Every structure is written in structure tokens, then in C-alpha cells.
Design a protein around this ligand. Structure first.
Ligand SMILES: O=C(O)c1ccccc1OC(F)(F)F
Length: 171
């Protein structure tokens, strides 16, 4: 059975309980926490690529008012569907299953200015999604794995002081 498990789920849930925020910048910013997953049930002999994209969690934008996140507007036109290819791709099933798969180098941006970055809209909520694909597969089989523990709001600057403090404590 294919099984994809979120690593450091307790750490993600500490951020999610505050409402998680990730900074987006012109030139792009790495995530904290880093999305990491454990994988079993691939064919160890087959080759696969790991892809990451970000799905809009909501049909509205958000704002931080009186220490709380609340609806802040109609949603802006959706960011383009940017896909990050895990840099170990393509690789054997055995490679992906021997140790957790870490998306440490993905960068979130608010400007289409190159570098294989992911464009997000500030003050919109996103859910990370991992895709597995098999090299050679005539079926072009894709799996999709959603991690609701890792939902966050994209911001140009941290709104919640408790998030600023969590990011410093655990990073
Ligand atoms: O080996 C395959 O057929 C395959 C194809 C696309 C994605 C995952 C796959 O691995 C598994 F889900 F475990 F089957």
C-alpha cells in the first residue's frame, strides 16, 4: 500500500493552532517548518519524481484584526498553478523510502521573477500538496497527497506576534 506520512506533525500543529503564516518576497523565501514526508509502498525498483504545489484553501482573503484572523475581502484571481520538482527527481523508489523526503529549498514569492519559485497571493490561505509520478509510465499516473496540518496564510510580513516568536523558538 502507498503510504505518505507527514514528518514533524506535532511541530506543524503548534503553528496551525496559531494560524500559520509564511513570508512571500520578490526574490522568494524558504518555508519554516519545512515540508517533510515519509514514504512506503513505492516499487523500490521503479523511478519516480516528487512534485509540490499549493492549493487555495478558501474562497476569500484573510486579514488579522484584534489578534484574530477574519475574512478580509473577495478572493483575488488565483495565483498561477506553479509546480516545484523535488531536486532529487527522478530517483528510485528505494531512494525516496530510505529517509524522509524534505522540500527544504522551495521558495515562496509574490513576484514572477524566475528561479523555479512558487507564486502565492498575500493574505490567502494555501494547503501544500505532494504529487508522485513514475518515470516511463504510459498511464502518466499521478498521486496527490494533501496535508491540512501544513495550511498557512501567505503574508509580506508576520501579522501574529506569537507566530514571529514560534518561528524564532523552533528555527
Ligand atoms: O508504481 C506506480 O505504479 C506508481 C505510479 C505513480 C505514482 C505512484 C506509484 O507508486 C505507487 F503508488 F505505489 F503505486
Amino acid at each position: 500500500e502507498l503510504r505518505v506520512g507527514l514528518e514533524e506533525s506535532e511541530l506543524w500543529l503548534r503553528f496551525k493552532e496559531l494560524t500559520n503564516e509564511m513570508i512571500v518576497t520578490k526574490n522568494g523565501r524558504r518555508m519554516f517548518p519545512v515540508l517533510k514526508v515519509n514514504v512506503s509502498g513505492l516499487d523500490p525498483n521503479a523511478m519516480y519524481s516528487f512534485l509540490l504545489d499549493f492549493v487555495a484553501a478558501d474562497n476569500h482573503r484573510w486579514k488579522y484584526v484584534n489578534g484574530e484572523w477574519v475574512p478580509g475581502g473577495k478572493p483575488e484571481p488565483q495565483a498561477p498553478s506553479c509546480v516545484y520538482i523535488h531536486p532529487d527527481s527522478p530517483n528510485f523508489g528505494a531512494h525516496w523510502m530510505k529517509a524522509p523526503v524534505s522540500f527544504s529549498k522551495v521558495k515562496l514569492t509574490n513576484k514572477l521573477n524566475g528561479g523555479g519559485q512558487i507564486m502565492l497571493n498575500s493574505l490567502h490561505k494555501y494547503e501544500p500538496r505532494i504529487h508522485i509520478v513514475r518515470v516511463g509510465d504510459p498511464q502518466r499516473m499521478i498521486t496527490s497527497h494533501c496535508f491540512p496540518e501544513t495550511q498557512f496564510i501567505a503574508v509580506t510580513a508576520y501579522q501574529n506576534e506569537e507566530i514571529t516568536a514560534l518561528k524564532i523558538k523552533y528555527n
